[PDB]
Amino acid sequence: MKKGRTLMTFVSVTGNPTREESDTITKLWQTSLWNNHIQAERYMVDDNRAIFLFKDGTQAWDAKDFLIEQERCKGVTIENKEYPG
Ligand code: NA
Incomplete structure (x- = not known):
């Protein structure tokens, strides 16, 4: 499969x-x-x-977990859903 694999x-x-x-x-x-x-x-x-x-868009949530733990990370947005840092 090609399409709908990635996530911004x-x-x-x-x-x-x-x-x-x-x-x-x-x-x-x-x-x-x-x-x-x-x-x-x-x-x-x-x-x-x-x-x-x-x-691999599936990984976006695991990446988000890592990102919001960072001091200079204000927050992460995944498909119009915001995860505050
Ligand atoms: Na802050």
């Missing part, structure tokens, strides 16, 4: 970060997830907000 999510960063600061931070998270068998593409969309696109 939004990850927000706390404070008033510059785009480059959020970039450094969210990159750390992306790599940690990658190193733990959760592969995702990461795109900056705001100064404090990135899209995490999970290659």
